[PDB]
Design a protein around this ligand. Structure first.
Ligand code: SF4
Lengths: 117, 353, 427, 180, 160, 166, 95
């Protein structure tokens, strides 16, 4: 085990940080002049409309996102190995290499094919 | 924490409260000195009126920010729009205060870290991912499709480097064999400084901390002179300040971690006095980034992906495997020493023609 | 060792495919499979555990079949993009692993290894072929989810993730069922059949070949290791055999006809599962794979895109050999001695009666007589007038293949007493 | 897709509006739209004196003012057939190329600034200030010189302009190399 | 335990309700993030710490970002697009849904076990020997699965 | 509230606004580059307000209309102005802005002041950088409540909590 | 016992999800909740029968993650040239 106390201590901390956050925002929010909407409906640039209509966006963003998940799964697995690594011995290392090369093959496919397409 | 004391919940709260508001005040006077240090670099004088020495200007500035209209767009859905800065600041604040600063009891009889967990590194890595929520959501929240395009650019970049940060950080975790920061500090106290012993993992970590907006990505997008900046450009009042605030708290957090991990933040064979020496390492990195901040250009996003993804991760994973070999057979540590030293010679020689 | 060739090949080819033009990857992958088949043969009947991976008698029979099916499908394809060979390879590996494990977490991972490349192989981009893909995937992810949930409740009830742990009262009873859902769906035992008519129709023919033999084999492979209650089975079989044969009268398009049929066939195989014998079920699947394999090959040679009932007519005029091949195939699936198809049935039925389970066995037999309706609906249609419909002849390669297949069918029909000795449990 | 990179938003360093038809991320074509600053010189000068007109030519190119002026100066001078003494021709080149330095200096200042971070702007400007101050002495203004009239410059150089011009000629080589 | 415990499990269920109810996609997904956080807490609470941190890192940080990027790329201006002849299907959906809780409830009710066996907080220390031990094949299987996932995923989207 | 209750508070806030004036430039014509000048090096504006040149009009405040204002540009500008948060001032720099400059044409607009209301005029062409500092010094003392006309009467801090966006 | 009951409830909710939703992306979203219902169960029993159910869970997560990737990839690839993202209106396969 290890102290559950210190995980609690995180929760406390989160409660403090969130509080000071919200506190600042609520001061700011409540004070200020106002003139009701009738033209603050509009956003940046050229009056209304910031730039035309864009309807669709490239696959670029999908690809980048997708990479990150699969390789994040990699990292997840490589943490246990990082910790105990004199106990797992030489056989350990071979386990690691096998796994690594497999995800690296993944990599080489997406690299030789591209991250702008 | 199996060797370090726990503090009762109240005392935790007190430290937490101090460090949070500490980072507000931190951010305040940091903006001023950075502002001014840019000025000097560009052969000018920074703010220095608004008595006595420019040191009340952030007060004035801050007071200005409140007492302003709460612009809430028609075209924004309310809930996300108001929420969106909040999330980004919360998850940025969190996990500065993890980092140790001095040996036990040296805060009037209490611990200089707020928490200490039992898994340090994961917690850091985890909080770094949650910043990216804030970013793209804000984009969407405002509901301008221009803003949206900005935020995805931003997030895309972040998320790419974010993974690389992981494979960089494995290398010292090998050597100490534990996760918590403290173990890492104390290990270096004896054995000596992880920037010696795993130099290419130092490097990629540094250049990954660039990606926390440090300048030298910087087709972040920005808004000025470019395709619109993500998040901001639709925020106005206090909320806008919050976004910027977050970006700086990241900056100093990274500027602290690179000392904590890689240099031993309270390690020092000269004298260890608890807090003092930490602030001097902070100061150094602070200044390093501002020299960057001034003197170089930016990377055009296309270029930026090629650089992190394609180049940076192969140097990181090549190093992970090598060190993993060395650490696995539990050989003398000399063999990394030789390698670090050699890699430095490569990376030094590279600047020399 | 069979695993050894596949895994190695899979990785190696991944990168290789950049250097070679698309044909070289077809030549390569075709070869790979053939080597993997070789490696099986020379170690026949000798078992190798390594813990997780576990070579048994069973594995050997069912992956023999699976690789066969996979060779055929890679054969015919000509289309670009190195992946449309590559993926079939992958999927095969996935099935190899699937059969060769008992340990549930591996079994799940294996299920994904085979199911993933299948979803993508469902697209030559024909509009239907996206719909198909989609249905299969969404329904698939649900059955997946059950199989994962099942495993999690199993771990509760025994204290193991190996199959063959003891068992007890309600949770173990429940748990044992929820594993049947996932595995069940992949081989399509009604009611889980639903995707099998749409997906077979929508998907382009050669792909469907791979699916209709091999995936069914592999899925069944894993099903056998489950201890499936005699009660669960009685439900499954009945619904499969009923819905299969009855519903099939209604259809008039080749792919869908064979689809509903393959719900019925899943039902018939599932009889063997009562006692469970991979001598009986082994035999069955051999006759089923060959016959379906033959039959679906012919359907590719017509068009790679859905054909109505009429198109099959006149096959004898255009080519005599093919006309006979496809004929023999159709009778073999009806079950009609002295083609092997009867023997495949007979062995299964015998295991049902041996364990004693009568009502079910009767339904099965009755409705197999029903089956003759739509099967003659194809099988004779061959001799009638040709109409205007495509029929590109296809390679000399394949002509030889198809006729080989049809000879392997009728050969075991007269001579079943060759193979049965060595498809045994210990071999 | 259709991006409207606006008029003076966030900048362009003009007030140009561009209809950028984008396919994916590689720009097809940009259709420029101008008309956000036509303030009509051509019309107005049709209603002013020739002397007055020299105060209308440098309100066009801001940065390189003296070049417009000079170009006009010749055109009329030619027309009515005046000459222009030798010293004049000297003064006109010294200022003209000095103004060219003004234009390039501001150009490289903006260029680096534009994309690229902040710093090189300030250096490029600093040198420009020194040029403007030299100019200030002789024409009385930082820019929008009124120091050429039809036939030559309107008054002799002040005494102080030649020594100080020498000062800046020392520095510029070293500085130019440091921009490079 | 039931004092504090009650609240946290309540939150879990509540969060669950929201992600299948709410009629705007983003609000849904965002709720689901709150779900998986709570769940991460519940992992930590059950003497399984490492799994907790991986829950946040992978499931709430990786997976859901992928979800969100998809829901932005193509819009999702209503989370219930279609008023459709299947509008009848709402009460039948609620009916079967209840059924699946009932049957599962049966299987799980009256269960007797032990809760004594100490994982040791499930810290990565104690996970190392198993993971690269008896499960090492399974790991490599996982790894192959990922590689296949990459190859497939690319080939689906970009016609390669 | 609105910043104005206790004498004390409002004097605070008024200092707050006044010394923090972040300039948003609206470069336009020939003036503009001399307006950019006001930052670099020899002179300054980074020690009154700030160096920054706000990256949207949304998050800005003192709009410096610096240059010629073509008639076609007027409705755009009208809208750029409208979207500023509520305390907003317009310094109108240069003759060209202030009174249409010399051009009397159909094209140019005589006095930017028709459209957006001006608070400080700063005459000149280009008013040399030090003059621009002087303008902002004015506007500083304007917002403190210490601004007069020649007739002897004070003016309220803004002159644009007056006509606003309706 | 409380937690393990809760997991079954969370499963129930997920089913309600899959049947109700009328957007493709939100179907898939619901599936992901079900997969976590599972992973919780798996840990819950892991306290009883010790240690292997941890490793179990980790592998499970990974499978889920993999299945996310391909599935969302597909959902995108199907509807990247129309935007009526209802999960019906695939009626064209039926005979
Ligand atoms: S006032 Fe003078 S410097 Fe300014 S825009 Fe006009 S002509 Fe140019």
């Amino acid at each position: 085990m290890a102290p559950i106390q210190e995980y609690v201590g995180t929760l406390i901390y989160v409660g403090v940080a969130l509080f000071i956050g919200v506190a600042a925002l609520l001061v700011g929010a409540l004070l200020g002049p106002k003139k009701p909407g009738r033209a603050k409906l509009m956003p940046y640039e050229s009056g209304n409309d910031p730039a035309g209509e864009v309807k669709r966006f490239p696959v670029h963003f999908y690809v980048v996102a997708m990479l990150f998940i699969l390789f994040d799964v990699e990292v997840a697995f490589l943490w246990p190995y990082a910790v105990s690594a004199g106990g797992l011995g030489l056989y350990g290392f071979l386990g690691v290499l096998a796994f690594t090369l497999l995800l690296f093959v993944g990599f080489l496919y997406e690299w030789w094919k591209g991250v702008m397409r | 924490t199996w060797s370090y004391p726990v503090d009762p919940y109240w005392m935790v709260a007190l430290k937490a409260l101090l460090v949070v508001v500490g980072l507000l005040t931190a951010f305040a006077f940091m903006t001023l000195i950075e502002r001014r240090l840019l000025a000097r670099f560009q052969v000018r004088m920074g703010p220095n009126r608004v008595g006595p020495f420019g040191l009340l200007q952030p007060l004035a500035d801050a007071i200005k920010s409140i007492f302003k209209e709460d612009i809430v767009v028609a075209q924004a859905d309310r809930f996300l729009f108001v929420l969106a800065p909040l999330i980004s600041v919360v998850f940025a604040l969190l996990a500065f205060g993890l980092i140790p600063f001095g040996p036990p009891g040296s805060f009037f009889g209490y611990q200089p870290w707020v928490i200490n967990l039992d898994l340090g590194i994961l917690y850091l890595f985890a909080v770094s991912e949650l910043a990216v929520y804030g970013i793209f959501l804000s984009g969407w929240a405002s509901g301008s499709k221009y803003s949206l395009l900005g935020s995805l650019r931003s997030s895309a970049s972040l998320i790419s480097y974010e993974l690389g940060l992981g494979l960089a950080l494995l290398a010292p975790v090998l050597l100490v064999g534990s996760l918590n920061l403290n173990d890492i500090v104390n290990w270096q106290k004896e054995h000596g400084w992880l920037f010696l012993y795993a130099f290419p993992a130092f490097l990629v970590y540094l250049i990954a901390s660039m990606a926390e907006a440090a300048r030298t990505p910087f087709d972040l997008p920005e808004a000025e002179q470019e395709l619109v900046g993500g998040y901001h450009t639709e925020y106005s009042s206090i909320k806008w300040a919050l976004f910027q605030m977050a970006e700086y708290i990241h900056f100093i957090t990274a500027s602290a971690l690179i000392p904590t991990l890689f240099l031993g933040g309270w390690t020092m064979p000269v004298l260890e006095v608890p807090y003092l020496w930490m602030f001097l390492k902070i100061a150094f990195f602070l200044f390093f980034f501002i020299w960057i901040r001034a003197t170089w250009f930016r990377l055009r996003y296309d270029q930026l992906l090629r650089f992190g993804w394609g180049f940076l991760f192969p140097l990181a994973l090549l190093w992970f495997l090598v060190t993993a070999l060395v650490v696995a057979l539990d050989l003398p540590r000399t063999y990394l020493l030789y390698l670090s030293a050699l890699s430095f010679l490569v990376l030094l020689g590279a600047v020399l023609y | 060792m069979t695993l050894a060739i596949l895994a190695v090949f899979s990785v190696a080819l991944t990168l290789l495919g950049f250097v070679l033009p698309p044909q070289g990857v077809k030549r390569a992958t075709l070869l790979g499979l053939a080597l993997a088949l070789a490696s099986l043969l020379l170690t026949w009947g000798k078992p190798f555990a390594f813990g997780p991976y576990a070579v048994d008698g069973v594995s050997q029979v069912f992956t023999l079949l699976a690789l066969l099916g996979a060779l055929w499908t890679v054969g015919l394809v000509r289309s670009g993009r190195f992946e449309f060979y590559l993926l079939v390879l992958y999927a095969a590996l996935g099935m190899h692993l699937l059969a060769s494990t008992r340990h549930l977490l591996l079994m799940l991972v294996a299920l994904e290894a085979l199911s993933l490349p299948l979803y993508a192989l469902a697209t030559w981009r024909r509009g239907q072929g996206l719909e198909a893909a989609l249905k299969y995937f969404l329904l698939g992810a649900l059955a997946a989810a059950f199989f994962l949930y099942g495993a999690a409740l199993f771990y509760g009830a025994t204290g193991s993730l190996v199959l063959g742990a003891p068992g007890e009262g309600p949770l173990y009873a429940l748990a044992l069922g929820l594993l049947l859902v996932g595995l069940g769906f992949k081989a399509a035992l009604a009611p889980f059949h639903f995707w099998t008519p749409d997906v077979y129709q929508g998907s382009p023919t050669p792909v469907v070949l791979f699916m209709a033999t091999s995936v069914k084999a592999a899925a069944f492979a894993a099903l056998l290791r489950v201890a499936a209650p005699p009660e669960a089975l009685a439900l499954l079989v009945a619904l499969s055999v009923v819905v299969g044969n009855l519903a099939a009268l209604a259809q008039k398009e080749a792919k869908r006809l064979l689809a509903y049929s393959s719900i019925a066939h899943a039902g018939y195989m599932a009889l063997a599962l009562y006692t469970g014998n991979a001598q009986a079920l082994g035999f069955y699947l051999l006759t089923y794979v060959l016959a379906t394999g033959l039959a679906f090959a012919v359907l590719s040679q017509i068009s790679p895109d859905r054909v109505p009932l009429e198109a099959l007519r006149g096959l004898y005029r255009k080519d005599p050999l093919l006309g006979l091949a496809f004929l023999v195939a159709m009778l073999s699936l009806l079950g009609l001695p002295p083609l092997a198809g009867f023997w495949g049935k007979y062995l299964a039925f015998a295991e049902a009666a041996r364990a004693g389970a009568w009502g079910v066995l009767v339904l099965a037999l009755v409705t197999s007589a029903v089956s003759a309706y739509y099967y003659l609906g194809l099988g004779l249609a061959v001799f009638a007038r040709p109409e205007e419909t495509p029929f590109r002849p296809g390679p000399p390669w394949a002509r030889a293949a198809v006729v080989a297949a049809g000879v392997l069918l009728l050969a075991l029909g007269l001579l079943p007493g060759l193979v049965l000795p060595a498809l045994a449990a210990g071999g | 897709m259709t991006l409207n990179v606006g008029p003076q938003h966030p900048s362009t360093h003009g007030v140009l509006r561009l209809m950028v038809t984008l396919s994916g991320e590689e720009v097809l074509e940009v259709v420029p739209h101008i008309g956000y600053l036509h303030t009509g010189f051509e019309k107005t000068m049709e209603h002013r004196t020739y002397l007055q007109n020299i105060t209308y030519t440098p309100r066009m190119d801001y940065l390189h003012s003296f070049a417009h002026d000079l170009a006009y100066a010749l055109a009329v001078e030619k027309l009515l057939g005046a000459v222009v003494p030798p010293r004049a021709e000297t003064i006109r080149v010294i200022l003209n190329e000095l103004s060219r330095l003004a234009s390039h200096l501001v150009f490289l200042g903006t260029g680096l600034l534009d994309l690229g971070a902040l710093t090189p702007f300030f250096y490029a400007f600093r040198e420009r200030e020194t040029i403007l101050d030299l100019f200030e002495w002789v024409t009385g203004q930082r820019f929008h010189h009124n120091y050429i009239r039809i036939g030559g410059v309107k008054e002799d150089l002040p005494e102080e302009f030649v020594p100080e011009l020498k000062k800046l000629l020392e520095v510029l080589p070293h500085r130019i190399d440091e921009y490079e | 335990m039931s004092l504090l415990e009650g609240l946290a499990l309540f939150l879990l269920l509540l969060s669950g309700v929201l992600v299948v109810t709410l009629r705007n996609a983003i609000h849904a997904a965002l709720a689901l993030i709150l779900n998986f956080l709570v769940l991460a807490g519940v992992y930590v609470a059950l003497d399984a710490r490492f799994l907790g941190f991986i829950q946040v890192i992978v499931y709430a940080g990786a997976i859901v970002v992928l979800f969100l990027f998809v829901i932005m790329l193509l819009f999702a201006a209503q989370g219930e697009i279609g008023f459709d002849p299947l509008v009848r299907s709402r009460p039948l959906a609620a009916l079967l849904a209840l059924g699946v809780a009932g049957i599962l409830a049966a299987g799980l009710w009256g269960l007797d076990l032990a809760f004594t066996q100490d994982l040791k907080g499930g810290l990565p220390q104690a996970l190392g020997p198993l993971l690269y031990g008896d499960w090492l094949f399974v790991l490599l299987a996982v790894g192959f699965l990922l590689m296949a996932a990459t190859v497939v995923a690319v080939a689906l989207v970009e016609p390669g | 509230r609105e910043g104005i209750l206790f004498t004390t508070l409002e004097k605070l806030v008024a200092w707050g606004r006044s010394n923090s004036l972040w300039p948003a430039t609206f470069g336009l014509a020939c003036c503009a580059i001399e307006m950019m000048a006001s930052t670099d090096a020899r002179n300054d504006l980074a020690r009154f307000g700030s160096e920054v040149f706000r990256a949207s009009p949304r998050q800005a405040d003192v709009m410096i209309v610096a240059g010629r204002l073509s008639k076609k540009m007027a409705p755009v500008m009208r809208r750029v102005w409208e979207q500023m948060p509520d305390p907003k001032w317009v310094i109108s720099m240069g003759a060209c802005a202030s009174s249409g400059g010399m051009f009397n044409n159909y094209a140019i607009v005589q006095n930017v002041d028709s459209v957006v209301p001006v608070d400080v005029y700063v005459p000149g062409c280009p008013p040399r950088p030090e003059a621009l500092i002087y303008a902002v010094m004015q506007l500083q003392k304007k917002v403190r409540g210490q601004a007069y006309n020649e007739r002897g009467e004070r003016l309220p801090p803004v002159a644009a909590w007056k006509r606003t966006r309706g | 016992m409380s937690y393990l009951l809760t997991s079954a409830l969370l499963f129930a909710l997920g089913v309600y999800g899959v049947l109700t939703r009328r957007t493709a992306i939100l179907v898939f979203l619901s599936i992901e909740l079900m997969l976590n219902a599972a992973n919780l169960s798996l840990v819950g029993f892991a306290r009883a029968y010790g240690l292997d159910g941890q490793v179990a869970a980790l592998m499970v997560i990974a499978v889920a993650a993999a299945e996310v990737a391909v599935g969302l990839g597909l959902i995108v690839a199907i509807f990247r040239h129309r935007e009526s993202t209802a999960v019906d209106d695939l009626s064209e396969l039926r005979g």
